[PDB]
Amino acid sequence: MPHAFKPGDLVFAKMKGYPHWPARIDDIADGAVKPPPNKYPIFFFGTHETAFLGPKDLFPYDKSKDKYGKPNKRKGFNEGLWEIQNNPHASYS
Numbered sequence: 001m002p003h004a005f006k007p008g009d010l011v012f013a014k015m016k017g018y019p020h021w022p023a024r025i026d027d028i029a030d031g032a033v034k035p036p037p038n039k040y041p042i043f044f045f046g047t048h049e050t051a052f053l054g055p056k057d058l059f060p061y062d063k064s065k066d067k068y069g070k071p072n073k074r075k076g077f078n079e080g081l082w083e084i085q086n087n088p089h090a091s092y093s
Contacts, residue, residue, distance in 0.1 A: 005040055010061035010088050012068040013042045013053055020059060020068040021077065022084035026050065046080025048092050 005011075007027040012020035026041040028034055035041050039052040059068065061084065069085075071078050083092070 005055060005058060008089060010084060011042070012059040012061060012064050013044065013051075014057040014059070015051065015053075019072050019074060019077070020064070022046065022061070022069070022080040024084070024088055025058075043092070044076075044080065045083035045088070045092075046076035046078070048076075 005025050007025050009025045011023050011025065013023035014020050022045040023042050024045070026043040028041060035052040039054050040058070042051050042053045042058070043049075044051070061069075069081060071081065083090070
């Protein structure tokens with residue numbers, strides 16, 4: 001059975017106006033800005049941007065990849081597909 005989201009989990013993350021996007025739940029570094037309550041720090045592959053999202057916008061990657069893991073014209077997206085498949089736990093900073 002599912003657990004709650006934890007750092008390192010792989011997802012497609014949904015933002016309004018953008019396609020479901022390859023991403024991971026990030027850790028929060030010592031001394032770094034924390035997310036609001038009930039929100040997670042989402043690192044988007046390809047763009048390497050961070051937004052704070054709740055579970056309603058997080059789709060576990062294994063379950064969702066057949067639907068959402070197809071190339072997309074949007075900037076950064078196809079790089080993001082490579083990262084999530086090939087090195088999802090690397091440092092991209």
